[PDB]
Each structure stands twice: as C-alpha cells, then as structure tokens.
Amino acid sequence: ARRLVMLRHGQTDYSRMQGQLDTELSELGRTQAVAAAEVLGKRQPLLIVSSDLRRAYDTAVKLGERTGLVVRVDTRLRETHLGDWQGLTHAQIDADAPGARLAWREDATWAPHGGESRVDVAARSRPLVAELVASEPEWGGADEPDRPVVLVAHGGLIAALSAALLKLPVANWPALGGMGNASWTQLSGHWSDFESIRWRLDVWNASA
Amino acid sequence: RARRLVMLRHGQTDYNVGSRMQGQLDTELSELGRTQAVAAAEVLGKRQPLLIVSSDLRRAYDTAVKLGERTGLVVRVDTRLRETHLGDWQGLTHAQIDADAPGARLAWREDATWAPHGGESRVDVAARSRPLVAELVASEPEWGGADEPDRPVVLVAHGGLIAALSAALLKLPVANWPALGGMGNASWTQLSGHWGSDFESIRWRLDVWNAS
C-alpha cells in the first residue's frame, strides 16, 4: 500500500483570489510552514514534490530542511487558474456576478471564464502520480512501506486530484470540503497497471 | 445556513481489532483507550457542542461520558449508532475467517452491500443511522441557527458507522462508499450540511476525515 500525503501551504496575504498569481506567504504563513514541517517530518516522508508557486515552494523547503530531503518541483501542481477572478475579493466577485462563487463549488466541470475547472486540474496533475508510481521503487516498497510521497500544493488541486484518484463520479467531487491553511490529506493506494490501484481516503484536512 | 456534525470514534479497547472481529460485542476500553477519551474531549469539548449522542456500546458511551463531563452536557444514547453487526464473524480471528472463506474479508471491504452471514452491510448501517440525523435536524432548531451557527452536534460512535453514515449523507453512489478509509483511535470526522426545507435537500460536505 502506497501512501500519498498532500499539504496545503500556509496563509498568504491575499478573501482575495490568487489562482496562479505568485503571491507570498505572510509572516503567519511562514510560522505555519515550520509547524507543518515538524508534523509531517515525523511521518518520515520518502520524497517531496512542490508546485512552483512560491507559497507552496517556500512551504516545501521548510519540510525539506526538517527532513533533510531535496525538494522537487513540478508545474503541473500549480493552483487552478482562476481566469478573470484572479486578484478579486469575494465581495468584488459577488457584486459582479452574484451567487456564481457559491454555485462554482458545486460543479466540478465549471470554470470562471478563462480559468480551469476542477476536472482540468485533476487532468493535468494525475499523470504525475502515475509517474511517481513507475519511478519510485521504494514507495510502498518492502523495506520502508509506509513512507509517504508528500505533494506540497494548493487546496483546489488537493480536492480535484484526490477525487480523481478515489474515482469519485464528477458530480460528487464537491463532497470534498476546502482544505485549510497548513492542513494535510492522506490517500492510500492499495493493490497491476496504475489504473488498477484502488485509492482510499485515509485523512482529509487534518491540521498540521 | 450550515449545520456542523462531528463524529468521534472511541479509543483503544482491550481486544486485538487488527486480527479479530469485534462488531457489536460489548468490549471495554483499555487503559490507553480511557486516556484517549480524556484527550479527545479536551479538543472536542473546547467549544460547547449543541448535543452529544452516543452508541450504547460501552467503549463509545464511556468515551462520550468524558466529553459530557468536559462540557457539562448529558450523554444521550441511541442503539441506531451501534457498530456494524458482524454476525457469524463476531469474535472470530481473521485467520479463522480467511480459512473458512478465502477472499471474503478483503472483498467485503470493497462492497458496501455485502455483509457476513448474520450481519449488516454498510448500506444496512446507513439505513438505521441516517434517519437519526434527520430527527436531530428536526429536533434541534438552534443547529446552524442564526445565533451560534457553528456549534456542532457530536455523535460518539464507531469507525464503520462513520464511513457508512458519512457516505450516505454525502449521497455518494453506493459503488463509491469504499473510497472512505479507516478512522483511528479517538479520531473525529466532521461534515457540514448546507441548505428548500426538507431533509433530503440539505447538501452535506466532508470538512474533515479522521483527524486526531
């Protein structure tokens, strides 16, 4: 059984939608990266891959420091692009297109104009999980079986990728509530293609 | 307009759960199980729940009592929150079971409509427990109400029941119920039911699964 842990980065200064804007962790967010590093470092991560956005990457570096591991980076793990909503607050978006923000969360195929849907986000990240399965023999290996791959990413991607791996029907993707700052989720891949791997949800949105 | 529902699994029992089937056998918490109940109440009791309802199996009830003490609430009990009945498998080791019916134990986990002889499937457990949630919606007007919309209802229960009830509330297709994994000792799960006025139209989401 292969364990996959996903960590949502800590708090940024930004209420205000980011998507793929490369915003910075706040002071609090850095403090949260250190705390999460401690928590997850005890699970003895096998390997760390991070979105290249700084709020994720700076979080992942703190986990790398704690575990003495070298952080890997992949652009397919970026936050959902939020099109015309990037840079706008909820109050602005809600005044501009009333009720759309709330309806959006209930439909995984729907995107803000110019943005990606949750389905898009699962489509571009999932091959990364498949690639790690192929290339990391130790992962779920006989020697150290429960050492998890840790992905340092963003809330939207965690939910999209998790529902995709669990093979939830798209209409049920909203069953997964939003990840909090510096919170983590764990999936387990049980047995021989990648597709035949049965993923189960071990932990959703645990505070780190 | 969101109702918070927290489900707590009891702590460790003096019983080898990993190799031997418990079900509705009324096993006691171990000493560690008791310490875990105190610790879990310190976390969950920090904010005052609206209400505590417990399985009447003593490993859950004793856990719920620690929470009631911490919060100054009574503990109500309900047989509908009992652990999944495992029928002829109750008290049997995995080895006994795996020799009698090779492959059955692993196949069971992957089929929410399958039950050991004499027992209950995930679907059966959802059938007895989901209506209890509907009753609480009807009987707790403060729940998700205007005054303190965040105070949760707390069910003190069992792992299999948490997964069955949670999948039923989330309205996952039965085929997808095994996507919900295990719950640890003294771990909790939280759902939020978001707003018609009928129970079926409440849309539940998973806020937290298996936090310790």
Side-chain angles (χ1 to χ4, degrees):
Chain A
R2 284 183 185 94
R3 287 135 85 134
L4 179 59
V5 168
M6 309 187 195
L7 172 64
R8 171 162 186 238
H9 58 80
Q11 182 193 87
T12 53
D13 299 292
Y14 251 55
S15 167
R16 193 160 174 202
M17 307 238 68
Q18 296 158 141
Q20 299 187 4
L21 291 177
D22 206 352
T23 59
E24 292 277 357
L25 293 179
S26 61
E27 215 217 327
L28 178 57
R30 289 186 224 102
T31 293
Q32 288 170 341
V34 174
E38 247 142 29
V39 177
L40 288 191
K42 300 191 160 188
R43 331 271 304 185
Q44 313 194 357
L46 176 70
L47 158 171
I48 313 169
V49 202
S50 182
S51 145
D52 61 317
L53 297 168
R54 61 191 63 200
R55 68 192 108 126
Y57 184 81
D58 288 345
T59 303
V61 163
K62 287 319 167 241
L63 174 59
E65 296 178 0
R66 167 61 59 144
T67 62
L69 284 183
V70 342
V71 177
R72 298 132 79 134
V73 176
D74 205 299
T75 55
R76 290 168 298 180
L77 297 174
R78 291 209 201 141
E79 178 79 279
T80 307
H81 194 289
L82 294 179
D84 305 327
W85 288 1
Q86 289 188 182
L88 296 176
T89 171
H90 295 359
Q92 278 171 309
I93 284 165
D94 291 353
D96 223 23
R101 246 207 323 118
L102 294 204
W104 160 49
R105 209 210 65 86
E106 310 296 341
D107 188 349
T109 66
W110 191 96
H113 180 255
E116 291 170 307
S117 64
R118 285 280 175 99
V119 169
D120 290 336
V121 170
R124 61 157 162 91
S125 52
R126 191 181 192 250
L128 181 61
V129 184
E131 290 171 13
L132 295 172
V133 165
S135 67
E136 306 295 329
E138 315 173 65
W139 189 24
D143 323 50
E144 286 169 311
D146 310 332
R147 291 187 62 186
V149 160
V150 177
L151 305 188
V152 183
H154 310 267
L157 186 140
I158 303 319
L161 184 49
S162 294
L165 297 164
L166 297 173
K167 300 203 176 85
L168 302 187
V170 180
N172 297 109
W173 289 19
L176 304 181
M179 299 288 293
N181 304 319
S183 305
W184 66 276
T185 277
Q186 184 179 294
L187 270 37
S188 273
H190 295 251
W191 170 216
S192 294
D193 36 306
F194 174 74
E195 280 297 304
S196 85
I197 294 182
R198 276 188 178 247
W199 297 89
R200 70 180 71 159
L201 174 69
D202 298 334
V203 171
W204 178 262
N205 195 37
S207 162
Chain B
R1 1 179 65 154
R3 296 181 160 91
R4 263 220 285 147
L5 177 64
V6 172
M7 300 179 202
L8 173 63
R9 176 180 183 279
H10 60 81
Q12 189 186 248
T13 56
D14 180 11
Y15 201 78
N16 195 337
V17 284
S19 290
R20 153 110 83 173
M21 303 270 100
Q22 212 171 218
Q24 296 188 7
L25 292 177
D26 199 15
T27 65
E28 296 276 3
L29 292 175
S30 66
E31 176 55 44
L32 176 69
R34 288 189 222 103
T35 65
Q36 295 172 332
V38 172
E42 291 294 333
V43 175
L44 288 196
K46 257 152 186 294
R47 39 136 162 82
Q48 237 246 27
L50 236 15
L51 169 79
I52 302 170
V53 194
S54 181
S55 166
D56 63 329
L57 302 174
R58 68 192 57 199
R59 73 198 96 124
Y61 181 77
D62 290 349
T63 298
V65 164
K66 296 297 194 209
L67 184 62
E69 296 188 335
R70 174 61 178 83
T71 59
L73 290 174
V74 305
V75 178
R76 298 205 58 195
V77 93
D78 204 303
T79 60
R80 284 174 299 175
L81 293 177
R82 278 178 183 177
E83 177 65 284
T84 302
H85 195 300
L86 297 185
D88 296 347
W89 283 2
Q90 291 196 159
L92 295 189
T93 67
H94 296 189
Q96 292 180 282
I97 296 177
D98 295 355
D100 281 328
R105 188 174 50 83
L106 299 175
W108 161 56
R109 198 213 85 86
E110 312 297 328
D111 181 4
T113 78
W114 196 86
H117 185 255
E120 290 171 315
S121 77
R122 299 199 201 212
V123 169
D124 303 331
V125 169
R128 53 176 166 89
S129 60
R130 194 166 171 270
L132 166 59
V133 182
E135 297 178 1
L136 296 181
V137 168
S139 77
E140 295 292 342
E142 301 170 70
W143 198 14
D147 277 15
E148 329 181 72
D150 211 86
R151 294 180 68 184
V153 165
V154 177
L155 304 188
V156 182
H158 305 277
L161 179 127
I162 304 320
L165 180 53
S166 296
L169 289 174
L170 295 164
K171 304 173 176 104
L172 299 174
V174 153
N176 302 104
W177 288 21
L180 296 179
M183 298 278 280
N185 288 323
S187 295
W188 60 91
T189 275
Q190 170 180 308
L191 269 45
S192 290
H194 294 250
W195 166 85
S197 293
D198 52 317
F199 176 80
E200 282 310 311
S201 297
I202 293 168
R203 208 180 312 205
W204 299 84
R205 76 183 72 158
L206 175 66
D207 298 334
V208 175
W209 177 267
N210 187 35
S212 265

